[PDB]
Amino acid sequence: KLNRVVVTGYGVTSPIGNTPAEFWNSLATGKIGIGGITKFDHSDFDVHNAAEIQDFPFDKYFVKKDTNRFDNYSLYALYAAQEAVNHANLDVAALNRDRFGVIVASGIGGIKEIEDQVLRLHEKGPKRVKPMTLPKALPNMASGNVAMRFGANGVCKSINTACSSSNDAIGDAFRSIKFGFQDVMLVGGTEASITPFAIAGFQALTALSTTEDPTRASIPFDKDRNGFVMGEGSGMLVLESLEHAEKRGATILAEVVGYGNTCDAYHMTSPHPEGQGAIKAIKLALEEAEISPEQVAYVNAHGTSTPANEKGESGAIVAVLGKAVPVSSTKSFTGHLLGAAGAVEAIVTIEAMRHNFVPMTAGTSEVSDYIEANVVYGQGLAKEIPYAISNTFGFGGHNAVLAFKRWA
Amino acid sequence: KLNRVVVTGYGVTSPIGNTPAEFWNSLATGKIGIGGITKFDHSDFDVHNAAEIQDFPFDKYFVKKDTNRFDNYSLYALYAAQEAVNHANLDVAALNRDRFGVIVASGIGGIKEIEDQVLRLHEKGPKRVKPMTLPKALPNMASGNVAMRFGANGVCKSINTACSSSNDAIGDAFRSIKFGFQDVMLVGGTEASITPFAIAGFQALTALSTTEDPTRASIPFDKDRNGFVMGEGSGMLVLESLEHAEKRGATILAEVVGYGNTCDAYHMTSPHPEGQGAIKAIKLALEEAEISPEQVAYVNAHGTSTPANEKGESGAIVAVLGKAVPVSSTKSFTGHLLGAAGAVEAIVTIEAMRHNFVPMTAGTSEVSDYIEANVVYGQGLAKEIPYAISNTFGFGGHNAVLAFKRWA
């Protein structure tokens, strides 16, 4: 006896908008969120751009004192989760709190707190380290903070698969509800890693675009791509068993139907050259959804804008789905949200289905000649989308694919 | 069609031993692993003791150049995983690799790398930050590293619930196999956080014992307890469906029968004073295992040695199982292994069942007058242990309980 799993609401804070409305509008009008870095002095760096949240609505739910106990990585999640709960019209006082869980993925956690307190420790000694350092920094804290805010007494955990974190978090929540372990879950991801350390770390790895022009830095599938552009933010969804949603007269936005997770077991940072693991992940998701490849009307690509990623991802998409399926990467707009990528990308995917519109890959102007997938760039594509998939293939060889079904 | 899930092998690197035999011997003879800190200059700190691994068998599987790509948190997991595979007599080359997965939990990841690279960045600039910084540091990397070593192409992820990370990891692996998504999994946790930053962080929080005498620093349940002692290490287990193990003629060491995970949703660092979430987590594990409270023959406590922890834990244990079930905390020997605590404590639990013996809580000599649980201290207790539970209750309100069955 398995339950169908539906999405009843979502919230987002990102470089292109803090409500699904501003978020989608940016996608529809082609307004990117990438610009010169303002968070720290990057003059000695090779990387000078990032997709920042420059208008976080801090005042909506938080007070100045809140920063004493929450790093931005938690703040983004709390905001996004509150927005999702409002969106879903979820009455926590009407729930069985033992069947209400939370999963907040994050790839790096409160990395600004870590860097700042490590420096304080070395400059001023251990006595100067803030008591709230670990409660603010530890990557599982956002999930616990979200549970504390809403009184969720069920499952509570964080998942870390780097770039696939929130795809795996949503997949896990989906599976928990599907198999009857929980009835409602607040799930998603959060990241706040536009810091000197994290940018320097990815720059040393040589994974980031060093392209000075912000309009040409995140160009997935483009022959000129040269690395990803880091973004920050959080996406949070409210998932409920179909029965729970219907019984309370919830408004259904979409359905989660398949989840595939595999491992390349190949290299720590290089993805498998022929997308072998990705192929398998896509197939597992379609198999669970009980749909054929031709039924996939849109692919929200992982599309980070690195040379290796798109070669293998296009390769995998083609091997499974073919050359006609429209493909786009919204990291061209948002930057790569790391642990939050999958969650914000799930929101893109659902909105695409709700708007009968494939958002374009911004910036991209000429696809590598060897790339055979149907990359959507230049302008978005109006079309019916009854099923869509959202891919994430993280450092460490973590492949995750979610299959969604448009709601009737 | 649900599957039974069995343990066919396990490996450990810890402050009390790097083989189950050495590890068990330390427990049986009362040899603790807590001593003065040597990993860093602690002269300015208020905490000077920790449970360190001072004899890690680096040369067994590694070569000097391996430190260029693996932080200790990964080395420990790789060592433990190889030892588990050997113990299980598991030929990975003969498996259906798509049905073989890995979950390596960690609460903080390669925190030594982060601290060292943060300082390098501030002293020398971004150009001197090591390329392998993030591949060494990110908490999901150990999982990917383990999968790469063994060619595990199935599920690969990391779970972070602070002190409960590896209990949740094992629980998740158990659920994947039970529900037929995977047939074999290498699962456990790893932590390598005896560093200036992590110790300063926990010290600032006031969570660590400042007790000078290392034999009285980690004394779970003791009336004079005053904080935990940090440890480090890794525990990894091979779990297989019962069918998979029987088909290859594996020697079965134990069975995983229940998993309970709840959230206090109460405070970021303090556990719920009445242990309500803990009570529900224990009950969930017993219900899944289909056993009554009287069938629980031993409880391996979270027992970190903090005033709040044992008050609430003893209360939850007594509420569900009564005052006769023997309880012991092995953090009295190993220190608190944080994200790796549940994995090594699963090994303790299995080894106890295999030897008909409840290891004692070392150091402890007088329990708080309000503690009603049958705490074992002074000397261990010989008894048959047909079923046992292992508790973890971490920062962020994460509660996780595993129920094990003796094999049988």
Side-chain angles (χ1 to χ4, degrees), chain A residues 1-310 312-368 370-408, chain B residues 1-310 312-368 370-408:
Chain A
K1 313 278 167 150
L2 313 178
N3 301 85
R4 285 173 62 195
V5 183
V6 303
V7 181
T8 55
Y10 40 84
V12 54
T13 180
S14 71
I16 67 163
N18 307 308
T19 64
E22 352 181 304
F23 186 79
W24 178 258
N25 185 72
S26 290
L27 286 180
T29 65
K31 220 238 263 181
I32 71 170
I34 296 147
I37 286 169
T38 73
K39 293 178 200 280
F40 63 87
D41 172 5
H42 56 91
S43 56
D44 292 330
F45 287 62
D46 281 354
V47 171
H48 304 292
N49 296 310
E52 306 173 343
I53 296 165
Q54 311 184 323
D55 58 348
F56 182 58
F58 183 88
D59 290 332
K60 191 173 180 170
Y61 306 116
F62 311 120
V63 297
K64 180 194 173 205
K65 224 153 255 108
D66 284 330
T67 61
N68 288 345
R69 64 186 209 291
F70 301 123
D71 172 87
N72 278 2
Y73 109 102
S74 271
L75 292 179
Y76 296 160
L78 290 159
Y79 169 85
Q82 185 63 69
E83 291 290 315
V85 166
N86 293 348
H87 191 184
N89 199 31
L90 180 74
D91 186 352
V92 293
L95 305 176
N96 171 348
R97 293 177 193 269
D98 296 326
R99 315 266 313 164
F100 173 29
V102 163
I103 301 176
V104 184
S106 184
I108 328 189
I111 194 67
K112 179 178 172 33
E113 184 72 3
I114 298 177
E115 174 167 26
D116 289 1
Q117 302 297 318
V118 156
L119 289 165
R120 190 161 179 95
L121 170 59
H122 290 82
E123 274 159 23
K124 311 172 157 82
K127 275 151 178 348
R128 298 357 276 312
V129 162
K130 290 297 215 282
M132 288 301 95
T133 294
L134 298 179
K136 281 177 83 179
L138 298 170
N140 65 291
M141 302 296 303
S143 308
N145 286 333
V146 168
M148 194 168 153
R149 185 176 176 90
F150 304 97
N153 299 127
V155 168
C156 184
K157 67 177 142 171
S158 183
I159 285 166
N160 189 334
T161 50
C163 331
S164 286
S165 306
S166 44
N167 242 17
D168 285 311
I170 292 162
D172 211 57
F174 157 66
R175 288 279 177 79
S176 285
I177 295 158
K178 168 157 167 189
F179 290 83
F181 288 106
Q182 295 280 269
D183 298 323
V184 183
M185 302 275 298
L186 255 171
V187 52
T190 185
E191 210 76 71
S193 59
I194 305 172
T195 69
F197 173 72
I199 293 286
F202 279 114
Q203 181 185 272
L205 178 58
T206 255
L208 301 181
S209 172
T210 51
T211 294
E212 170 257 70
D213 182 350
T215 49
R216 286 247 93 201
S218 186
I219 52 171
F221 301 101
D222 200 274
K223 68 180 183 52
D224 283 353
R225 68 200 184 271
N226 61 163
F228 77 88
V229 179
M230 187 188 289
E232 63 171 345
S234 173
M236 287 296 283
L237 280 49
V238 176
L239 295 196
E240 299 177 50
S241 64
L242 180 48
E243 151 181 358
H244 191 271
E246 292 191 322
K247 165 137 237 248
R248 87 190 178 73
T251 290
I252 302 163
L253 315 190
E255 188 182 354
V256 180
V257 287
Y259 168 44
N261 53 335
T262 68
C263 185
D264 278 2
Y266 176 68
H267 192 274
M268 312 187 318
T269 53
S270 284
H272 191 271
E274 62 122 287
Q276 192 180 75
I279 281 163
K280 293 177 178 154
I282 293 161
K283 292 177 159 168
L284 281 170
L286 300 190
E287 285 166 20
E288 181 168 29
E290 291 162 339
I291 65 179
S292 70
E294 321 89 61
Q295 278 185 276
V296 181
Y298 168 51
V299 176
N300 184 277
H302 172 52
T304 52
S305 208
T306 76
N309 179 77
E310 279 98 74
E313 182 164 21
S314 176
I317 288 160
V318 175
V320 183
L321 307 178
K323 310 156 169 220
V325 72
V327 177
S328 68
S329 169
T330 46
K331 291 187 171 64
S332 61
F333 283 88
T334 65
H336 184 3
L337 261 64
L338 305 161
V344 161
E345 283 153 26
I347 289 165
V348 171
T349 305
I350 286 158
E351 286 302 354
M353 291 201 306
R354 297 192 75 208
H355 293 257
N356 314 292
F357 186 84
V358 163
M360 72 164 153
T361 305
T364 298
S365 60
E366 193 183 343
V367 174
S368 284
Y370 56 79
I371 279 167
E372 314 186 300
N374 178 20
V375 180
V376 178
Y377 67 92
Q379 55 282 310
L381 197 228
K383 76 168 278 186
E384 288 290 296
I385 313 172
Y387 284 101
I389 66 168
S390 174
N391 300 342
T392 59
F393 310 118
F395 297 117
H398 301 108
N399 306 309
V401 174
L402 286 174
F404 302 93
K405 169 172 199 327
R406 182 179 68 187
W407 184 259
Chain B
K1 324 250 175 154
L2 299 188
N3 294 89
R4 282 170 68 196
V5 177
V6 296
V7 183
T8 55
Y10 44 79
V12 57
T13 179
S14 79
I16 68 173
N18 304 309
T19 66
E22 309 188 327
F23 182 84
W24 180 262
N25 185 69
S26 291
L27 294 178
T29 62
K31 284 142 189 176
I32 74 178
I34 296 154
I37 291 171
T38 70
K39 279 193 212 276
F40 64 87
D41 175 359
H42 47 100
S43 67
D44 292 339
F45 287 65
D46 290 348
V47 178
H48 305 289
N49 287 322
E52 294 175 355
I53 293 165
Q54 304 173 325
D55 60 357
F56 182 60
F58 182 90
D59 300 330
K60 187 167 184 181
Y61 305 120
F62 313 120
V63 298
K64 163 217 213 214
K65 281 193 196 81
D66 289 331
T67 62
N68 294 344
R69 66 184 202 291
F70 302 123
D71 178 85
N72 279 359
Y73 104 102
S74 278
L75 296 174
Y76 298 164
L78 284 162
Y79 169 83
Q82 187 67 65
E83 289 295 308
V85 161
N86 291 351
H87 191 195
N89 193 36
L90 185 68
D91 174 4
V92 304
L95 296 178
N96 174 341
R97 296 166 53 186
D98 294 324
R99 309 274 300 167
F100 173 30
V102 173
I103 299 180
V104 174
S106 188
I108 329 167
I111 199 55
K112 179 175 173 41
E113 184 79 1
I114 296 172
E115 177 173 18
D116 296 358
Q117 302 298 311
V118 163
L119 296 170
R120 183 75 167 167
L121 164 66
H122 290 84
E123 297 165 9
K124 318 293 266 196
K127 269 187 212 281
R128 313 274 235 122
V129 163
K130 296 302 253 250
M132 295 300 97
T133 297
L134 296 181
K136 282 173 79 176
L138 297 176
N140 65 291
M141 304 296 299
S143 271
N145 288 336
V146 166
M148 192 173 327
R149 186 172 176 92
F150 300 101
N153 293 129
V155 174
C156 183
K157 68 176 139 176
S158 183
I159 294 182
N160 193 335
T161 48
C163 326
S164 279
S165 299
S166 53
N167 247 19
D168 283 313
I170 291 160
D172 204 72
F174 154 72
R175 289 277 179 76
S176 292
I177 294 167
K178 163 169 187 178
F179 286 88
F181 291 102
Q182 293 284 265
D183 298 327
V184 179
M185 276 175 95
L186 254 169
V187 58
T190 186
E191 208 75 67
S193 63
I194 302 170
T195 64
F197 173 74
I199 292 289
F202 282 113
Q203 178 183 287
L205 192 51
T206 73
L208 301 179
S209 165
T210 55
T211 301
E212 181 176 276
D213 181 351
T215 66
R216 282 289 290 172
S218 184
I219 52 183
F221 298 102
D222 196 278
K223 70 176 182 80
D224 294 332
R225 67 198 184 275
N226 62 183
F228 79 86
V229 174
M230 197 190 274
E232 63 172 336
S234 176
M236 288 294 294
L237 291 68
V238 172
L239 295 192
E240 296 177 53
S241 63
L242 171 60
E243 185 184 309
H244 187 277
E246 277 171 351
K247 287 185 188 306
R248 71 182 190 87
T251 294
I252 298 162
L253 304 178
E255 181 176 0
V256 182
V257 287
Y259 167 45
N261 53 327
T262 65
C263 187
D264 279 0
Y266 168 76
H267 190 274
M268 305 174 5
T269 49
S270 294
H272 184 265
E274 297 166 274
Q276 212 68 359
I279 283 166
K280 293 162 170 158
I282 295 172
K283 281 180 153 153
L284 283 172
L286 297 189
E287 301 166 3
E288 175 164 35
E290 296 171 58
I291 61 162
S292 58
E294 320 91 70
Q295 294 184 267
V296 181
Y298 168 45
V299 175
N300 180 276
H302 177 46
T304 52
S305 205
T306 72
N309 180 69
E310 285 98 77
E313 181 166 23
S314 166
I317 290 170
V318 168
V320 183
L321 316 170
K323 301 171 205 192
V325 67
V327 179
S328 67
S329 167
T330 48
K331 284 192 181 59
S332 57
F333 287 87
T334 66
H336 184 356
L337 267 67
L338 308 172
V344 307
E345 290 152 18
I347 294 175
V348 171
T349 302
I350 294 160
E351 290 276 316
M353 293 192 299
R354 294 182 63 197
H355 296 261
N356 310 286
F357 194 80
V358 172
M360 75 172 160
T361 301
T364 294
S365 55
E366 171 158 12
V367 168
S368 291
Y370 56 74
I371 282 165
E372 301 185 328
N374 183 10
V375 176
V376 179
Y377 63 88
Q379 51 283 322
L381 175 71
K383 70 178 286 193
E384 285 202 47
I385 305 162
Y387 282 98
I389 65 169
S390 178
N391 296 346
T392 60
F393 303 121
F395 302 106
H398 301 113
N399 308 306
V401 179
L402 287 177
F404 294 96
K405 184 193 191 299
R406 182 174 66 174
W407 191 263

